[PDB]
Amino acid sequence: TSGSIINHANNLNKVINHVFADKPLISETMLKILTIDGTTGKDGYRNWLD
Amino acid sequence: MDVLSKGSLKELLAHLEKTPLEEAISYRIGTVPYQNVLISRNEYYNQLYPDTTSLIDGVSREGQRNVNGLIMSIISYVVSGSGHYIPNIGFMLLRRSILDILTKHDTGLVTNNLNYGIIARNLTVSKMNCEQRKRMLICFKLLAYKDGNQNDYEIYLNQNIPLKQIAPNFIPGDMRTVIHNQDQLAIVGIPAYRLTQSTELSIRDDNAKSYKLGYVDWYNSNSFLRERSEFNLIRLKDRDTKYGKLNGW
Amino acid sequence: YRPRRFKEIEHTHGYVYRELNQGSLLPLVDANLKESSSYYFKKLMSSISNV
């Protein structure tokens, strides 16, 4: 509803870390995909959400 | 393959100015068109797949030795990638560019009597796609303005509504119109979808796919010009400049 | 000169603020031909004499 795509994806990763704190592998794996996709910028972040 | 890769009116017209007429004609005898044939398509069927030969396939075919045949071969080269077999035309005509043949009176060819109805019928237009039709309408428009038959071109378009809807908008004598045009005229290119190394049933589709897979090989080969990497190595004459315009336009 | 590789973001979303109009130096050169010529000739010789 509000905010940017970059902020939407970055803050979603933090909540994933908090919700799945018992299994840290989930956040580590998701950030691996974001690192590859995020090099293109806002379009890369949109692809990650897709 | 090079002609089919042009995606804009500027690039297509620039290529036609550079290339000579000998590229439009072919020196292989081929076969005759409008013939019902049985071809072998073993990836799909065991029997022989029926089809009909046409002038739009990418294979060379025997053509008539007249001005009508010469124009059909030029349009076939533009919309299919290969021309027909019309020999002994003469070195005076074969040296000149395809654009000069289409829109210059100095060449000596007489094209006033040409009728667009039979040319479209012979160069089967019910079997073309949107990109192929646009290129043919470009050739018709260039010819019409060469012989002062603009009124006949308009009436022909008004008779055929679908052709009018996709007809490119440019004046053959003005370069500003070519720059502003944003039609997509590319028949081969880098595909967004998944292109595989498989056969197609029709003669037209199989030959078109061969050109498409061929362009991918050429795109990744050493003959392609990557502007972002070696723009300072091209000569100044052939470098891309906005001031650049077609001769006489 | 070796070509410069821009990042992919610069190529799609890159913008530059530049003024593309070139002003002629003729008004100064024509008015003072002797002074303009002497200035540039002396500058070039100081550079060439060091080859």
The nearest alpha carbon in chain C to B231 belongs to C3
CA pair distance B190, B215, nearest whole angstrom: 8
Of C1, C3, C11, the CB nearest to B229: C3
Inspect the structure and tell me whether chains B and A have 3 or more CB pairs less than 8 Å apart. no
Say if residues B98 and B76 touch (Cβ distance below 8 Å).
no
Which one-letter DSSP state was computed for residue B51? E
* Three-class SS of A7-44: HHHHHHHHHHHHHCCCCCHHHHHHHHHHHHHHHHCHHH
> From the CA atom positions of chain C, what is the Rg in Å?
20
What's the resolution in A? 2.9
Nearest Cα neighbor of B65 from B89, B36, B94, B93 is B89
Q: Are C13 and A39 inside 8 Å of each other by CB?
A: no
Torsion sign across C-alpha atoms B55, B57, B63, B69: positive
Largest CA distance in chain B: 58
Distance of alpha carbon C11 from alpha carbon C4, whole angstroms: 12
Technique of determination: cryo-EM
Q: Name chain C contacts of B229, Cβ cutoff 8 Å.
A: 3
Q: Measured between alpha carbons, how far is B24 from A30 in angstroms, rounded to an integer? A: 55
Q: Strands of chain B (E only): list them.
A: 36-40, 48-52, 61-62, 84-85
| Chains in touch with C (≥3 Cβ pairs < 8 A) | A, B
Q: Give burial (CB, 10 Å; 0-12/13-18/19+) of B242.
A: exposed
